[PDB]
């Protein structure tokens, strides 16, 4: 009884700028030794579900992860369709379940504002940078960081996952860590967030400059 | 997305005649999704499933009363229908009109109507 | 004869606000399947429609107070009210989709004396 099983909900960048969602279905703590997990989708619908890809990845802790990514239709996640992951495993007689829908709740545009850290002695060829996002809601929001128009790599920032704020509504952080050498090609860069609440096309952005 | 469905139809029906009920969807179509079922409550009885009509059109009916029932929908109006011939007494009860969520090969009546009363008098 | 009968106990009972509730439905057949078992549990107040309370034999509906609670496997199944409430006032149902037809259990009276 110490495995455990996540569902994840389509990021807002994949759901409204790709226009290509997926949900995965994720499963830890699963010792190599114990046979395979069959995983399996079902819609609450009853309309069928896409060939979806399966993963499984040796850890350095010793447990198994096992993810299951499923592609879902635009419509489809948008109109409240309600999607469904199931685990079963030999070793376990009852089956585990996770379901996902779209979050009902108020709406709220999320407000963007982006600082540069000033210069620190013996960080000189360095400069950091960040951006609060805050107040929108539901917590579903992505964050990526642009330089010269070209948008930079995910593993290059940090961002918290959504908190509450003493409001209603939630607010991450992202912290991005820029060398000289860019800040000097253009020293513009863009904190874009993607929230289905903000109007339009669900972006809102800030520039900063070092 | 909230759903509500309304029978109609319902009355007093003299043995032997023929009946027809019909369930109003308003809020979702019935040919996007789900299953659509039709189930009766007799008298001081257990609830007893009828009928059912998928979304994509297969029909499903009760051993107990199948032969001389039939389950329709009406694209236009998004309405289905529940016909009975050869009433009986036993065929007095309410009739409920259900939307059937789906999970792993199995149906579950997660939305009911407000149901309507059918009496047979001999 | 190869319906699956569904049989709840007790037929009737009277309980007070607080109260722990217990309903037991026996199935003619095992209703189990891939690890599941497809055993709905349903509450009908006098008179009004239906509602759904658990689906799956313990996979709670939305919208439905936490105090509700589903168990069981193949042919035994219990619905668990932790903390009786007078809006629990109500005849629950038991009923299979397992396999054709969809047949339900007798149903339990909760009177709250």
């Known amino acids: 009884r110490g495995v455990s099983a996540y569902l994840s909900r389509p990021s807002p960048f994949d759901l409204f700028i790709r226009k290509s969602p997926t949900i995965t279905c994720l499963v830890v703590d699963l010792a190599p030794s114990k046979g395979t997990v069959n995983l399996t989708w079902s819609r609450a619908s009853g309309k069928p579900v896409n060939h979806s890809t399966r993963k499984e990845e040796k850890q350095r802790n010793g447990t198994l992860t096992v993810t299951s990514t499923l592609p879902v239709g635009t419509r489809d996640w948008i109109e409240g369709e309600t999607y469904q992951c199931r685990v079963t495993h030999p070793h376990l007689p009852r089956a585990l379940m996770r379901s996902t829908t779209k979050t009902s709740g108020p709406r709220a545009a999320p407000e963007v504002y982006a600082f540069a850290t000033p210069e620190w002695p013996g960080s000189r060829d360095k400069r950091t940078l960040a951006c609060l996002i805050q107040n929108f809601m539901p917590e579903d929001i992505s964050v990526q960081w642009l330089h010269n128009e070209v948008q930079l790599p995910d593993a290059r920032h940090s961002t918290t996952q959504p908190r509450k704020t003493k409001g209603s509504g939630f607010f991450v952080f992202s912290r991005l860590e820029v060398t000289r050498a860019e800040w000097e090609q253009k020293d513009e860069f863009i904190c874009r967030a993607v929230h289905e609440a903000a109007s339009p096309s669900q972006t809102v952005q800030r520039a900063v400059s070092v | 997305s909230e759903v509500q469905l309304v029978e109609s139809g319902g009355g007093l029906v003299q043995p032997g005649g023929s009946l027809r009920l019909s369930c109003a969807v308003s809020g979702y179509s019935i040919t996007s999704g789900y299953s659509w079922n039709w189930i009766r409550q007799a008298p001081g009885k257990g609830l007893e499933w009828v009928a059912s009509i998928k979304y994509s059109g297969e029909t499903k009916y009760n051993p107990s009363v199948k032969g001389r029932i039939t389950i329709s929908r009406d694209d236009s109006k998004n309405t289905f229908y529940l016909q009975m011939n050869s009433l009986r007494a036993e065929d007095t009860a309410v009739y409920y009109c259900?939307?059937?969520?789906?999970?792993?090969?199995?149906?579950?009546?997660?939305?009911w109507g407000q149901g309507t009363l059918v009496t047979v008098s001999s | 004869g190869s319906d699956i009968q569904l049989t709840q106990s007790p037929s009737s009972l009277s309980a007070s606000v607080g109260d722990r509730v217990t309903i037991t439905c026996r199935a003619s057949?095992?209703?189990?399947?891939?690890?599941?078992?497809?055993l709905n549990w349903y509450q009908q107040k006098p008179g009004k429609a239906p509602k759904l309370l658990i689906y799956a034999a313990s996979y709670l509906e939305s919208g439905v107070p936490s105090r509700f609670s589903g168990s069981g496997s193949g042919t035994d199944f219990t619905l668990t009210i932790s903390s009786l409430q007078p809006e629990d006032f109500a005849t629950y149902y038991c009923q299979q989709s397992h396999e054709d037809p969809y047949t339900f259990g007798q149903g339990t009276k909760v009177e709250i004396k």
């Open positions: 057949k095992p209703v189990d399947g891939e690890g599941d078992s497809y």
């Open positions: 259900a939307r059937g969520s789906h999970y792993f090969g199995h149906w579950h009546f997660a939305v």
